[PDB]
Amino acid sequence: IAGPLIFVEKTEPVGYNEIVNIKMGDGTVRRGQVLDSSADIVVVQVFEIFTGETLKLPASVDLLGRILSGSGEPRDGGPRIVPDQLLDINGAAMNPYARLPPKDFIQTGISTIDGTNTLVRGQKLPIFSASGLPHNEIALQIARQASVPGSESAFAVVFAAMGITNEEAQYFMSDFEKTGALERAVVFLNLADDPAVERIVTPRMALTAAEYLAYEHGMHVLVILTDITNYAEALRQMGAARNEVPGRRGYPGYMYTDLATLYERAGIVKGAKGSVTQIPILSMPGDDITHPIPDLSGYITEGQIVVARELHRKGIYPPINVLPSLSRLMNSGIGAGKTREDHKAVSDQMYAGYAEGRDLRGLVAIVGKEALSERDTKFLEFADLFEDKFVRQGWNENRTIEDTLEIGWQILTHLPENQLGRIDNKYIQKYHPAHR
Amino acid sequence: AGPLIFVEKTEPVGYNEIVNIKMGDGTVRRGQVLDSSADIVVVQVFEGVIFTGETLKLPASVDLLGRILSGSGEPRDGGPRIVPDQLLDINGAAMNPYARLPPKDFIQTGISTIDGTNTLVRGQKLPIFSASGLPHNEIALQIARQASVPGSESAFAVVFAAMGITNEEAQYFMSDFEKTGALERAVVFLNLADDPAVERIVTPRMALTAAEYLAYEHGMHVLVILTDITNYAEALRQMGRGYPGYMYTDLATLYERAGIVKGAKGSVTQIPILSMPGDDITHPIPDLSGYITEGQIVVARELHRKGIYPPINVLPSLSRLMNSGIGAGKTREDHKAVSDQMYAGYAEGRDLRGLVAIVGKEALSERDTKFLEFADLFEDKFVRQGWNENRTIEDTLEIGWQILTHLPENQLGRIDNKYIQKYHPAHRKAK
Ligand SMILES: Nc1ncnc2c1ncn2[C@@H]1O[C@H](COP(=O)(O)OP(=O)(O)OP(=O)(O)O)[C@@H](O)[C@H]1O
Ligand SMILES: NCCc1ccc(S(=O)(=O)F)cc1
Numbered sequence: 001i002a003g004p005l006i007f008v009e010k011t012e013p014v015g016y017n018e019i020v021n022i023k024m025g026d027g028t029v030r031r032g033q034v035l036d037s038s039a040d041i042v043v044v045q046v047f048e049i050f051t052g053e054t055l056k057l058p059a060s061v062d063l064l065g066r067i068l069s070g071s072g073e074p075r076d077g078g079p080r081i082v083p084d085q086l087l088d089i090n091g092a093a094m095n096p097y098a099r100l101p102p103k104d105f106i107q108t109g110i111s112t113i114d115g116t117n118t119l120v121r122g123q124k125l126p127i128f129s130a131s132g133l134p135h136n137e138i139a140l141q142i143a144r145q146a147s148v149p150g151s152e153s154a155f156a157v158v159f160a161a162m163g164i165t166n167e168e169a170q171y172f173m174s175d176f177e178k179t180g181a182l183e184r185a186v187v188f189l190n191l192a193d194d195p196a197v198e199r200i201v202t203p204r205m206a207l208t209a210a211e212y213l214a215y216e217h218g219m220h221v222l223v224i225l226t227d228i229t230n231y232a233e234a235l236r237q238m239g240a241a242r243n244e245v246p247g248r249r250g251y252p253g254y255m256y257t258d259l260a261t262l263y264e265r266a267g268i269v270k271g272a273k274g275s276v277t278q279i280p281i282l283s284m285p286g287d288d289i290t291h292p293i294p295d296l297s298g299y300i301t302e303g304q305i306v307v308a309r310e311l312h313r314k315g316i317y318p319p320i321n322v323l324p325s326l327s328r329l330m331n332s333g334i335g336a337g338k339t340r341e342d343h344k345a346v347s348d349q350m351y352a353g354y355a356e357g358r359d360l361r362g363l364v365a366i367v368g369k370e371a372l373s374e375r376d377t378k379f380l381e382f383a384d385l386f387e388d389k390f391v392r393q394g395w396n397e398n399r400t401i402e403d404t405l406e407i408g409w410q411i412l413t414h415l416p417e418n419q420l421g422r423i424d425n426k427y428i429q430k431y432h433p434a435h436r
Numbered sequence: 437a438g439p440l441i442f443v444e445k446t447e448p449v450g451y452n453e454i455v456n457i458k459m460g461d462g463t464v465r466r467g468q469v470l471d472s473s474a475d476i477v478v479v480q481v482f483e484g485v486i487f488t489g490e491t492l493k494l495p496a497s498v499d500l501l502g503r504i505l506s507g508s509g510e511p512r513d514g515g516p517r518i519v520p521d522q523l524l525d526i527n528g529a530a531m532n533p534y535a536r537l538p539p540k541d542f543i544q545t546g547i548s549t550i551d552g553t554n555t556l557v558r559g560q561k562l563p564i565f566s567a568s569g570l571p572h573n574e575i576a577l578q579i580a581r582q583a584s585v586p587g588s589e590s591a592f593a594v595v596f597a598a599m600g601i602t603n604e605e606a607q608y609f610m611s612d613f614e615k616t617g618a619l620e621r622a623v624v625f626l627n628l629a630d631d632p633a634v635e636r637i638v639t640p641r642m643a644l645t646a647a648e649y650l651a652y653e654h655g656m657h658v659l660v661i662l663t664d665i666t667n668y669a670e671a672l673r674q675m676g677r678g679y680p681g682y683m684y685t686d687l688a689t690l691y692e693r694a695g696i697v698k699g700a701k702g703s704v705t706q707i708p709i710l711s712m713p714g715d716d717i718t719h720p721i722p723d724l725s726g727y728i729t730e731g732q733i734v735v736a737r738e739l740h741r742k743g744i745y746p747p748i749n750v751l752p753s754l755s756r757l758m759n760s761g762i763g764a765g766k767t768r769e770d771h772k773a774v775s776d777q778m779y780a781g782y783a784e785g786r787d788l789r790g791l792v793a794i795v796g797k798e799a800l801s802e803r804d805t806k807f808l809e810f811a812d813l814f815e816d817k818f819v820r821q822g823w824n825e826n827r828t829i830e831d832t833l834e835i836g837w838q839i840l841t842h843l844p845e846n847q848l849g850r851i852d853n854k855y856i857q858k859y860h861p862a863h864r865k866a867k
Binding site: 004264289 | 438439459465481483527528529532567568569678681684685686687688689690691692693712713714715716717720721722723725726728729732734736737738740741742743749751752754783786787788789790791792793794795796797
């Protein structure tokens, strides 16, 4: 009767496939079999230590301002968390999600996100990148800048790093402490050499903490997870998936729904007072042949933010290419009363102009700048202005959606007013710098 | 430094030799010889007694249809050299047939996960995003065989270009096009892995040039399939340890060549295959995002591993111009609603697979079990289809309506009552 995978505290040595009884968070008992384990954690697959208890998160608002390991133990030299509640972490705990669509605005402070691919409360918007690109730097800037403008609910951040180096850990820790962002954040840091099982538990501890804060304390919580790919690397070598090939015989069935137990955990929480939003980092692995991992495409259902090496090589930060980027729920979180009435129009116009300008880079290479029309030259130049002024921003520059929109209107000014076909006259008259 | 311009080798040249290139308008741009094959010179442009070269030309003629050529345009089918009625500069700087018009009508691919949920539109650029070991080429071949433009007064044609392929893949491609009759309306450009690197980079330009000629001078809707861009980028890797900086601008000279042509009686649509390398150390992963501006079709390992063909995951897939090409008079009035409803239902079902693995199968509500099962039906009956199964948009929509009857009518939040009463199987009238 193979079923859900749970995590239980290890109190004694246990053997692979050992039958055990588990005392769950809700007080009920489960029958299961052991799959793998670390010094403090064992992975069990439920059916229907000999008699153990589930690994739990010491749920408490005191988690905020703390930096913990993947298993919830202090890394900041502080005392262990004094729990207000001990919650199971596999996702069965509170059943906090409402059947409501994601909808309001979350200000990341990054123009290429807030302006053209708006992140909304309850959404899961992955950052798609690759080795060598600054995705962690982007994840860190969002963590310290993110807020929920005009909201009556408090805002919190759950930052979860997986399989990182000592240097990286140092990097992250010092930043949260120096900026003060730590006061409104719970940080879970899993090192590359920490037990694999601990990496697997890391995203679950994070999400459980997120759900608790969102549901128990009516907060809008932003969960940043980096990097799924590293999570997937530990997963493929854990338990019964060990030395097994995906799609073949012997590959554990749970191996293909595992990522789903993570991306299913996002959304507005019951009561509609809080919510859990996810920003997972999906870094393209360069070893699909040697290290086959679970398909990560399942995490992409509401869009994605694309990090491009092209912009990175041009010396632009953050190197986000808005063209292949998308936020399917964007229309929920923008407009009058959320951002500003002209948000959709400006974003639409910048996208159109930037896409045109980029195509023109090809034409100019085909016929020469001397042969390009005046009109086309304007768009060609607009693409440069967009990348140089809108896309590019400092690592410590936190732009309000108003700043983002103004920069947008400023560069749009470079195009002929008669070429702004994506902006209704009403807005052109009201916000265009020439009629303002 | 780029950009790259191809010139016919009319006289001996040397590396770094400064030369003048005769543009199709009588003017001349100057560059430097970067590399060259025996008949083609690759020049990098800037901005008497020196070489003045002619741009490499494509022997254009409707007689191109039904022919299998090499990346350089030479017969590979044993047939005679193409008798041109026009010599077209393959760099694209001689005609520019594109209209200032947005892509708009329907292109029926016959594949449900494309036509139904992320529709291909005439003049659009819709890449197939895949990876090593996946069947993107089989999907590409199927589209080439089945694609059409229902109700269009303009004829339809296919331009299929393969870069750096093996001899076995070539034979396999030539065989399919020939036995199905698909070759009858196609111009096939085949470049083999051993062919000079120079011929590999001219291949897509020869293809796009043939496409523009048919579309603009013969008022045809042309579908251009390029598989793949990664091999193309590999050829650029070393022409004169990642890819050269000019690659990004170079790729732009390819993706700018798409759209409705002047007169709006024709168009060029591109379906480039972008497969990610299975190994980065040797085959670094290039940034081909410049080609992705109108969406993409995602081939997913998950579906392939489950034994489903075509393994297309609609959730991450997207067609930004879909609304242009659907609805009454194009496909059917209920298209957008069925598409929205299936997408939402599939996404919900997939999330529930997550919940099932958290609380267990028997813990799911009856309602949730309904969606969980719909996800299975979607993959088993909508996604899955034969490699030779050409579905009309009607078949696709009807298959959609059938699996949707698994969901509670009160759950079809994406379909307004008017379409429910008219098309829902439980309400539709016999007629
Ligand atoms: N699981 C997935 N795997 C691959 N591609 C996906 C997946 N899900 C969605 N996509 C699509 O692929 C695109 C991401 O690939 P993209 O071209 O951005 O790579 P990249 O980040 O530019 O690589 P590079 O490291 O060279 O910059 C997105 O536009 C998205 O639409
Ligand atoms: N790698 C070979 C480059 C090359 C090859 C041939 C020439 S010659 O074409 O002018 F006949 C010039 C340069």
